[PDB]
Amino acid sequence: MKFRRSGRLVDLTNYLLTHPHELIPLTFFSERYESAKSSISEDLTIIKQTFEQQGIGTLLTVPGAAGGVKYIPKMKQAEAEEFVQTLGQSLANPERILPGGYVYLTDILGKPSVLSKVGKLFASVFAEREIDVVMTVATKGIPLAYAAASYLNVPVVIVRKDGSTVSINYVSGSSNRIQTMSLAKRSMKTGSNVLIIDDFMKAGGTINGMINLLDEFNANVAGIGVLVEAEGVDERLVDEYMSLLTLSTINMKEKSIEIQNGNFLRFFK
Amino acid sequence: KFRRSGRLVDLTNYLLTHPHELIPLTFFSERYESAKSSISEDLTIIKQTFEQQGIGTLLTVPGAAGGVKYIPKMKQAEAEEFVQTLGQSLANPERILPGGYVYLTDILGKPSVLSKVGKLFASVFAEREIDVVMTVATKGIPLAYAAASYLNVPVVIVRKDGSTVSINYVSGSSNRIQTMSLAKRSMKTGSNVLIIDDFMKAGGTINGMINLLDEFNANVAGIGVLVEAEGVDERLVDEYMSLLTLSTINMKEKSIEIQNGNFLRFFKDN
């Protein structure tokens, strides 16, 4: 059933938005709308231009009758900065101060609207990494991992803090003892390029634990993103990582809490 | 300024990313610096397309207090096709688990699958007045978020570990009493809660969750599970929707039975 341009633009927009990071043959669309490849290409130029102008993302086109298009979610620096500032202000509330130097995030992480933004910012920053899968550890980071994975078009793998399983010992920020994390061996292909995502990085042991867990799968760290990094941790982590926010050494007794920008802007050109 | 074409693309993106939200025509008129008449015409193009393509319903509410609202909906034919495909995939003997369980980890890890399940849940409960989605850690978490994002509501996660509320219940794995808790600061009392879970075997977990909401003057708006163990619709007095039915996996024999759940009852049988 043929759609005229207006109907195709609408359906193509929905289809692209719901199939990010997937190379779609022009052929799939020409047959879907029983339209000429040339009309589709024309429609895609309109979408590509609107997507860039509105800060939705990039449409990459591969020419030829055998060509295709790929939608790449991307966030403009201006929106990233504004979103992060707003989010930081929201967290810089003494009522969130938690024992041990932690921050209460449960409410913000319960909101798909916020997670969507966070996920897209991670997806944007790591758009060009060849990611095969997103990994995080139960449980606070799970929703962040799915948000990022949905923009990236890859599966999520959840490491458990408890079949043929692989296990690694690691230490946590509570400046505590040795714990173990595991992941079933049939949960991930060898050589996978992994984006590690977590909500909070205090000491860096949880992430180092996941990075070490990856060596057991002969997998590679494709990138590392965290919502909040405790002040001065660039030290305890060997791999590059991206953070949206920095929690400056909080104090429960003084009931003060400072929150600054993470290092994310370094990732914008 | 936006030419009609660009405006349709942006409007489409805008509606798709703001479901279950009443948006005043004025907002669009201002965004595109255009007459309301032109916006309404675009909305008709989108409504028609969304309807024919099975994306959802664009609801236009007349009046200055009105506006437009995008409601994600899934056609019955697509839901049946999707559930069957999902069922066939789970009926693989390789997913065998002791105790009458099936391996769901790999599918619960795919946003593509989650998106569909979340949409089907959001579609069935589209007209219920839901304020929050609730699930219990940790398997159901991604399904909960998927449903919640289509419904425009926050997610609340019950912990099985300050002013905390608690309930005790018996899982389907162990007969030992368990405790699920939820911070009092995690949910507004009187909320219409859509409960979501991956697998309902005994029914205790969901029952426990139903009791826990009592403690908040909360009202169960609906219950949705991905898989229900054969023989559970006599262990729950509450109405629930399930996508698949898992017939007691063949312990000794390497076979597994999967059939549609009761979801068709929630489509146009209403």
CA B178 to CA B204: how far, in whole Å?
Answer: 10
CA A52 to CA A19: how far, in whole Å?
Answer: 17
A chain contacts of residue B8, beta-carbon cutoff 8 Å: 6, 9-10, 13
* CATH, domain range A2-73: 1.10.10.10
CA B224 to CA B137: how far, in whole Å?
Answer: 15
Q: Which residue has the tokens 């312990």?
A: B251
Judge: A49–B6 Cβ closer than 8 Å, yes or no. yes
Nearest residue to B153 (alpha-carbon basis) of B114, B126, B113 = B126
A98 — contact with chain B (CB < 8 Å)? Answer: no
CA B31 to CA A22: how far, in whole Å?
Answer: 30
Sheet holding B257-260, edge to edge: B155-158, B132-136, B192-200, B219-229, B241-247, B257-260
Contact A139, A160 (CB under 8 A): no
Contacts of residue B214, defined as CB under 8 A and 6 or more positions apart, other chains included, come to none
The pair of three-digit structure tokens given for residue B76, joined into one six-digit string: 């019955």
In Å, how far are A8, A14, A83, B58, B167 from B239, measured between CA atoms? 40, 33, 40, 28, 21
Distance from CA of A133 to the nearest CA of B (A): 10
B chain contacts of residue A186, beta-carbon cutoff 8 Å: 106
3-state DSSP assignment of residue A73: strand
Please name the member of A9, A18, A115 whose beta carbon is closest to the beta carbon of B9: A9
In Å, how far are A125, A210, A265, B82, B231 from A269, measured between CA atoms? 10, 28, 8, 42, 58
3-state DSSP assignment of residue A61: strand
How do strand A165-171 and strand A156-159 relate by DSSP bridges?
A: unpaired
Nearest residue to B238 (alpha-carbon basis) of B268, B213, B257 = B213
Contact B6, A50 (CB under 8 A): yes
The pair of three-digit structure tokens given for residue B186, joined into one six-digit string: 């995690």
For chain B, give the secondary structure using H, E and C: CCCHHHHHHHHHHHHHCCCCCCECHHHHHHHCCCCHHHHHHHHHHHHHHHHHCCCEEEEEECCCCCEEEEEECCCHHHHHHHHHHHHHHHCCHHHEECCCEECCCCCCCCHHHHHHHHHHHHHHCCCCCCCEEEEECCCCHHHHHHHHHHHCCCEEEEECCCCEEEEEEECCCCCCEEEEEEEHHHCCCCCEEEEEEEEECCCHHHHHHHHHHHCCCCEEEEEEEEEEECCCCCCCCCCCEEEEEEECCCCCCCCCEEEECCHHHHCCCC
3-state DSSP assignment of residue A138: coil
The pair of three-digit structure tokens given for residue B85, joined into one six-digit string: 């495909």
Please name the member of A47, A112, A154 whose beta carbon is closest to the beta carbon of B148: A112
The pair of three-digit structure tokens given for residue B246, joined into one six-digit string: 């898992």
What does A196-224 look like in DSSP terms, one character per residue? EEEEEESSSHHHHHHHHHHHTTT-EEEEE
CA A213 to CA B254: how far, in whole Å?
Answer: 32
> May I ask the CATH class of domain B73-270?
alpha beta
Question: A205: phi > 0 → left, psi -120 to 50 → alpha, else beta; which?
Answer: alpha
> Which architecture does CATH list for B1-72?
Orthogonal Bundle (1.10)
- Any idea of the CA torsion for A62, A55, A154, B242, to the nearest 10 degrees? -120
CA A67 to CA A56: how far, in whole Å?
Answer: 22
Q: How far apart are the first and last CA of chain A?
A: 44
CA B256 to CA B100: how far, in whole Å?
Answer: 9
Q: Please, what's the b/e burial string for A34-54 (b: 16 or more CB within 10 A of its CB; e: otherwise)?
A: ebebeebbebbebbbebbeee
User: What Rg value do the Cα atoms of chain A yield, rounded?
Assistant: 21
How do strand A156-159 and strand A68-73 relate by DSSP bridges?
A: unpaired
CA B71 to CA B51: how far, in whole Å?
Answer: 11
Please name the member of A110, A147, A157 whose beta carbon is closest to the beta carbon of B156: A110
Q: Please, what's the b/e burial string for A102-122 (b: 16 or more CB within 10 A of its CB; e: otherwise)?
A: bbbbeebbbbbebbebbbbbb
CA B39 to CA B58: how far, in whole Å?
Answer: 13
Judge: A14–B16 Cβ closer than 8 Å, yes or no. yes
> Which architecture does CATH list for A74-269?
3-Layer(aba) Sandwich (3.40)
Greatest C-alpha distance within chain B: 69
Peptide bond connecting B138 to the previous residue in cis, omega within 30 degrees of 0? yes
CA A55 to CA A68: how far, in whole Å?
Answer: 22
User: What Rg value do the Cα atoms of chain B yield, rounded?
Assistant: 21
Q: List, as residue ranges, the binding site of B for 5-phospho-alpha-D-ribose 1-diphosphate.
A: 137-139, 159, 197-199, 201-202, 205
DSSP letter (8 states) at residue A186: G
Contact B126, B103 (CB under 8 A): no
Nearest residue to B51 (alpha-carbon basis) of A35, A30, A46, A14 = A14
Q: Which residue has the tokens 């009609």?
A: B4
Judge: A146–B111 Cβ closer than 8 Å, yes or no. yes
The pair of three-digit structure tokens given for residue A77, joined into one six-digit string: 């620096």
Contact B47, B58 (CB under 8 A): yes
The pair of three-digit structure tokens given for residue B4, joined into one six-digit string: 């009609």
Angle at A261 between CA A256 and CA A267, to 5 degrees: 160
3-state DSSP assignment of residue A41: helix
Domains of chain B: which residue ranges? 1-72, 73-270
DSSP letter (8 states) at residue A96: G
